[PDB]
Structure formats: C-alpha cells, structure tokens
Amino acid sequence: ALESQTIAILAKVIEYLILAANYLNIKNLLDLTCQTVADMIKGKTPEEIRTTFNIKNDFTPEEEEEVRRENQWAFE
Amino acid sequence: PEEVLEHVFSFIQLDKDRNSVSLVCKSWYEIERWCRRKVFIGNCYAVSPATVIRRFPKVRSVELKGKPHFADFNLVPDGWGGYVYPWIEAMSSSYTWLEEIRLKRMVVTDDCLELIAKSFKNFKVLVLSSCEGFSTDGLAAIAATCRNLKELDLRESDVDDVSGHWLSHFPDTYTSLVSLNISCLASEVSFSALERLVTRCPNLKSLKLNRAVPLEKLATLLQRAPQLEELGTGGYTAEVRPDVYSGLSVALSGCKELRCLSGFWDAVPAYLPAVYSVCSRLTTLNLSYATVQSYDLVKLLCQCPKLQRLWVLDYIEDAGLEVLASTCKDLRELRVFPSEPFVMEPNVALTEQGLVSVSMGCPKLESVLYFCRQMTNAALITIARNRPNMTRFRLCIIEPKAPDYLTLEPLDIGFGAIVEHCKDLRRLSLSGLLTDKVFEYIGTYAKKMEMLSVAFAGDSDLGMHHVLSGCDSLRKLEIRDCPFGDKALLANASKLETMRSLWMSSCSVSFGACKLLGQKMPKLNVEVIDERGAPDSRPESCPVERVFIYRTVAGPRFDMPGFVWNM
Numbered sequence: 001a002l003e004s005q006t007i008a009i010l011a012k013v014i015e016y017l018i019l020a021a022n023y024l025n026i027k028n029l030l031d032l033t034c035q036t037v038a039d040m041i042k043g044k045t046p047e048e049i050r051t052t053f054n055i056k057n058d059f060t061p062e063e064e065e066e067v068r069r070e071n072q073w074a075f076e
Numbered sequence: 077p078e079e080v081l082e083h084v085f086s087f088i089q090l091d092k093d094r095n096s097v098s099l100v101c102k103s104w105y106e107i108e109r110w111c112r113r114k115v116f117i118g119n120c121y122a123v124s125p126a127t128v129i130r131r132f133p134k135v136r137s138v139e140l141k142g143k144p145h146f147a148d149f150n151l152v153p154d155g156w157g158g159y160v161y162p163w164i165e166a167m168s169s170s171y172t173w174l175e176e177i178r179l180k181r182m183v184v185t186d187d188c189l190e191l192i193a194k195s196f197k198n199f200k201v202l203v204l205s206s207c208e209g210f211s212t213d214g215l216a217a218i219a220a221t222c223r224n225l226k227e228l229d230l231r232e233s234d235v236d237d238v239s240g241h242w243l244s245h246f247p248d249t250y251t252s253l254v255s256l257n258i259s260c261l262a263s264e265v266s267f268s269a270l271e272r273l274v275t276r277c278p279n280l281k282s283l284k285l286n287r288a289v290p291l292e293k294l295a296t297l298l299q300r301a302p303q304l305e306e307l308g309t310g311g312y313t314a315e316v317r318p319d320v321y322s323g324l325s326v327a328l329s330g331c332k333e334l335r336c337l338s339g340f341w342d343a344v345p346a347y348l349p350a351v352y353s354v355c356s357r358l359t360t361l362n363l364s365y366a367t368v369q370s371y372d373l374v375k376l377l378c379q380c381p382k383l384q385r386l387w388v389l390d391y392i393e394d395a396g397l398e399v400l401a402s403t404c405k406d407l408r409e410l411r412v413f414p415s416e417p418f419v420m421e422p423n424v425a426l427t428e429q430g431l432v433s434v435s436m437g438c439p440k441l442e443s444v445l446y447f448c449r450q451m452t453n454a455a456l457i458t459i460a461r462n463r464p465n466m467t468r469f470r471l472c473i474i475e476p477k478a479p480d481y482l483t484l485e486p487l488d489i490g491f492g493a494i495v496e497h498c499k500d501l502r503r504l505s506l507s508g509l510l511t512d513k514v515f516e517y518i519g520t521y522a523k524k525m526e527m528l529s530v531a532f533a534g535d536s537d538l539g540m541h542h543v544l545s546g547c548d549s550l551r552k553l554e555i556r557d558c559p560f561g562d563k564a565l566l567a568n569a570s571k572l573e574t575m576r577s578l579w580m581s582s583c584s585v586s587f588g589a590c591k592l593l594g595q596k597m598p599k600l601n602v603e604v605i606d607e608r609g610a611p612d613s614r615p616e617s618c619p620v621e622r623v624f625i626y627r628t629v630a631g632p633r634f635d636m637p638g639f640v641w642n643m
C-alpha cells in the first residue's frame with residue numbers, strides 16, 4: 001500500500017492491466033495476472049495464440065518450418 | 077513487453093506448450109529459449125548436444141532416452157549405441173547451473189559420473205532408469221562430490237558390483253537426500269553407513285532398498301526415517317519371531333506418511349501382516365517379487381481401499397482380482413506379471429475372467445498390463461464395453477498365436493472393440509492369433525493411439541499398411557516376427573517422418589528396401605542391425621535381422637558399431 005519498490009488507471013490496484021503491476025513493483029499481483037495469461041496459452045497452437053493477441057507472424061515459412069521440425073523431432 | 081513475457085513464460089512448463097510459444101514469432105522464439113528450464117529428448121540420436129546447447133543455453137534439467145524399448149527384450153545387441161558421454165562433455169562446459177539428468181536406456185560410465193560430479197556444483201537429481209556401463213566406483217564418485225544431491229535413483233540399472241562401499245563416501249555433512257533407490261544394486265551396502273545416512277537426512281521421502289538389507293534391520297531404518305512416503309523393503313524373509321514381527325509392526329505404523337510400498341523379495345506370508353497399519357492409506361502397492369499365494373494377497377488387498385496402482389504376480393488369480401474389484405474403487409492401473417512363463421502349463425488359476433472382473437469393478441481403471449494364458453473376444457468385448465475410459469492396454473497371451481479358446485477364432489474382433497470403444501486408447505500391445513483384420517480395426521479406430529507393439533500377428537503388408545495409413549497419433553510402432561515387409565514400409569515412407577521411430581525385427585524387410593528407403597528419405601536414419609556381417613554380401617532380396625528407423629535433425633550417427641549400417 002506502498003509496495004512497488006517502484007515507490008517506497010487506479011483500477012482494482014487499490015481494491016487489492018499488468019502494465020503495470022509490473023510497474024511499480026507489486027510482486028504478488030504480477031504473479032496473479034501472469035499465471036492467468038499463461039492460461040490464455042497452455043494448450044493453444046501458435047496461430048491460435050497470435051490470433052488472440054495481436055502478434056502477426058513474422059516467420060517466413062523457411063524458418064517457421066525449420067523451427068517446427070526441431071521442436072517436434074527433438075524437443076517433444 | 078519483455079519482463080512480463082519472461083514471467084508469463086515461467087508459468088508454462090509443458091514441452092508442447094513451450095514449443096508452441098517459440099513459434100508465435102521471432103521475439104517469443106527468443107525470450108522463450110533463454111528462459112527454458114528443462115529439455116526432454118526422447119531419442120538421443122534425433123538431435124545433437126551442440127544443437128541443444130546452442131538453442132537453450134540456460135538449461136537446468138535434461139532428460140535423455142537411448143536405446144528403444146525392445147532392448148528390454150534383448151533384441152538390441154551390445155555396442156549398438158546409447159552413449160551419453162558426448163552429452164556430458166558438451167553440457168559439462170556449457171551448462172554450469174545444471175541440476176538434473178534423467179537418462180533412460182543409455183550407456184553411462186564411471187567417467188561420465190565423474191564428470192557430472194566434477195562439472196555440476198548445484199547438481200541435485202540423477203535418475204538412471206535402465207542404464208548400464210558404470211560400476212560402484214562411479215557411484216562413489218557421486219557420493220563424495222555432489223554436495224547438494226537430492227535424488228539418487230537407480231531404477232533397474234545394470235551395475236558393476238565392485239563393492240557396497242560406494243555408499244559410505246557420502247560425507248558426514250551431507251544431509252540433503254530426498255530420494256534413494258538402490259534396488260538394482262546386488263552389492264551389499266554398509267548397513268551402519270546407510271543407517272547413519274538415513275538419520276542425518278531429514279527430508280528423505282523415498283527409500284528403496286536392495287535385497288541385501290535383511291528384514292531384521294528394516295525396523296531400525298524406519299525408526300530413523302519416520303517421514304517416508306515411499307518404501308521399498310529389502311529382503312523380506314526371516315525366522316518367524318514375535319519380537320521381529322512386532323518391531324516391524326510398530327516402526328511401519330510410525331510412518332504415518334507412507335503411501336507406496338514395494339520390495340518384498342522372498343517375502344514370508346507370516347510377515348506381510350506387519351504392513352496393515354499402512355494399508356488403509358496406501359495408493360501404490362508393488363508385489364511383483366512376492367511369491368505369496370492368493371489368499372495372502374487377498375488379506376493384504378482387503379484393507380487397501382485408497383489403492384490406485386497395483387502390480388502383482390498372477391498368483392493373485394481370478395478370485396484374487398474378484399476381491400480387488402469390489403475392494404479398490406479408486407484403482408487406476410493394474411499389472412499382473414507372470415509367475416512362470418516358460419511352462420505352457422497353468423500353475424495358477426489366472427484367466428481372463430480376472431481382467432473382466434476388474435473392469436466392471438473399477439470405474440477408474442485405465443492402465444492395464446496383463447499376462448494370462450487364454451482369452452476370448454467376449455472378454456475383450458466386455459472389457460471394452462465396460463471401460464471406454466481406458467487409455468493403455470497391453471495384453472499378453474502366453475502361448476503365441478493363441479486363438480479365442482471357446483470359438484477357436486482370431487482375436488481381431490476382441491481387439492477391434494478395445495480400439496473402437498476406447499477413444500483415448502493412447503497405447504496398445506497385442507497378442508493371440510491375429511489376422512490383417514485387427515489392423516484394419518486399429519487403423520480405422522485407434523486415432524489417439526501413440527504406441528503400438530505387435531508380435532507374431534497379421535497376414536501381409538496390408539496389416540502394417542492399415543496402421544501406417546490410419547493411426548493419426550502414432551509415435552512409436554515396433555514389430556517383431558510378423559509377415560510385414562517392404563511394400564507397406566515404402567507405400568508409407570512419409571509417415572515415418574511423423575513418428576519418433578519404428579522398429580522391425582525378424583520380419584520380412586529386405587536389404588533392398590532398406591537402401592531404397594534411405595535414399596528416398598535423407599532425414600530418417602534407417603539403421604540395419606544385423607549380426608551376420610555385410611548385408612551387400614547377401615542377395616539384396618534377403619530379409620535383414622532388424623532394422624530401426626528414426627527421424628532426426630542430426631543426420632547419421634557417429635557411433636555405430638560394426639554390425640550397424642546407415643542406408
């Protein structure tokens with residue numbers, strides 16, 4: 001109340017997006033949001049994810065394929 | 077926005093999810109590799125130390141699998157490969173902060189162990205599942221040097237017995253042990269060293285003894301280890317004495333946290349009852365080495381209501397499993413091993429009704445390994461009917477090509493029901509008399525199936541072909557003594573690329589087709605493992621003894637012994 005050793009929009013910060021929790025240094029809440037974001041992802045394809053954010057691909061199939069190969073052949 | 081990403085990423089620990097993040101964009105590819113904690117490498121020849129080290133540099137935990145599964149059946153000759161040294165060397169200089177190394181079915185030597193010991197300061201977890209090639213000097217080296225060690229798990233490894241003296245090299249300041257598993261060691265460790273060890277290690281939750289620790293000394297160890305969650309007894313035989321029994325009984329019941337029991341070698345029926353204080357909170361029981369008759373087992377199982385995993389000889393019998401079936405409503409996994417395979421002559425009364433019983437009885441049963449001597453499609457159909465939730469089913473009928481014993485027919489419809497009705501069947505082992513039909517079955521229905529193993533089954537390449545053709549989820553297929561050959565294999569070469577491996581031995585795959593396949597498919601290592609010498613000194617139409625085929629991003633390997641050839 002007092003926390004972010006960044007200290008030491010008001011939104012729900014006081015009644016307790018990540019940006020910036022981050023900020024201002026509220027360790028615990030970073031964990032609150034980062035874990036639920038992480039869920040946004042667990043079990044989603046790379047497309048499914050980049051859809052549901054706004055990262056458009058910047059992988060030219062040359063590389064996009066070569067990665068998918070390493071990933072699957074060697075790391076799964 | 078980087079920091080936040082790092083942190084979001086820490087929450088993601090699944091290899092498939094990790095991979096998935098690395099492919100969203102260049103930037104996620106980059107953050108992700110840098111904060112990747114563990115790598116799983118299921119086929120050590122699929123990729124190279126250097127490739128791994130250079131992508132994922134801040135790695136704390138490495139898992140490697142060597143030889144394929146049919147090594148457990150003696151079907152991979154020595155020298156074949158599996159050497160882990162190249163990995164330790166590579167990681168030795170690159171991976172300072174390295175904590176865990178879990179190897180499966182690799183060759184590991186005293187030199188590796190030394191190097192692990194010397195290079196890895198924060199080193200905490202060494203599991204050596206089914207490895208070979210080191211001796212107790214190697215373990216000494218680990219005992220002496222690894223100040224922070226927490227797990228020393230030697231499940232099934234083949235150790236050279238120099239001396240049980242390795243264990244006493246753990247220095248008096250060592251306390252941090254969490255799990256110790258020395259059941260494969262035959263070398264008698266020093267009892268006082270051990271006992272002293274158990275005592276200064278307040279966090280040791282798992283202790284698995286070797287046979288050499290006799291029943292009489294068990295109670296002492298347990299008094300030192302009252303917080304144990306897993307115990308594997310040592311030897312479990314002794315003169316019947318109520319002092320002995322009683323000392324047992326008390327120590328055992330002072331372990332309020334104990335959930336898993338194993339060991340029981342040579343076990344005496346007079347001393348199992350000792351373990352009944354635990355029974356009612358027990359989740360895993362492993363009675364594989366106890367040759368205790370059915371009634372005894374029944375008395376033990378009656379009082380195990382929370383039981384999730386049971387492995388047991390077939391001494392349990394049908395009656396046995398009938399009890400189990402009413403008793404353990406929470407049972408998830410059952411493995412019934414054989415007591416006497418190399419007789420075709422039923423020494424126990426274990427039939428199919430056993431498994432049938434368990435399958436009406438246990439709403440949660442989903443893994444099975446079962447050895448009986450006879451079977452019927454009605455059993456199998458019933459099982460499939462009852463257990464749609466089944467996810468691993470490994471049946472093993474002892475006399476090969478054995479038909480359904482009532483109708484004399486193939487077991488194809490039996491197994492058809494399994495694969496039809498068990499939509500998440502992710503794994504499968506077959507036996508009995510089987511025609512190409514079962515395969516049409518597997519191919520049409522087993523869509524989630526990842527692992528298939530087959531022996532003395534099928535009619536023609538058409539069998540293998542339905543499988544490579546239909547099984548969308550296939551990762552490992554392994555075949556021995558079937559009449560599958562070239563046609564099926566080449567008609568489907570591109571599937572091989574979506575699969576970790578295929579293994580065929582004593583089949584009808586000609587040297588000719590092996591060469592062709594190599595050429596068509598640069599990126600598979602297609603390996604002929606043959607023991608009669610150069611293949612090109614036999615008519616190319618001649619069947620190779622064994623061929624092993626696996627995708628890799630590393631090209632052919634550098635360590636082939638003399639009897640292995642890359643196509």
Ligand SMILES: O=P(O)(O)O[C@H]1[C@H](OP(=O)(O)O)[C@@H](OP(=O)(O)O)[C@H](OP(=O)(O)O)[C@@H](OP(=O)(O)O)[C@H]1OP(=O)(O)O
Pocket residue numbers: 118141144145180468503552
């Ligand atoms: O996942 P994989 O790379 O295919 O490894 C599997 C798998 O291990 P995990 O499921 O723990 O990841 C099996 O697990 P289950 O099929 O039993 O659920 C395991 O089976 P068991 O340890 O229970 O026997 C099997 O072991 P194995 O092949 O010796 O039967 C092992 O196979 P790998 O040798 O290919 O790793």
Ligand SMILES: CCCC[C@H](C(=O)O)c1c[nH]c2ccccc12
Pocket residue numbers: 445470471472473505506507529530531
């Ligand atoms: C000692 C463990 C044996 C069980 C084994 C398996 O389930 O993989 C198995 C069982 N039935 C089989 C048929 C062909 C190849 C392998 C098997």
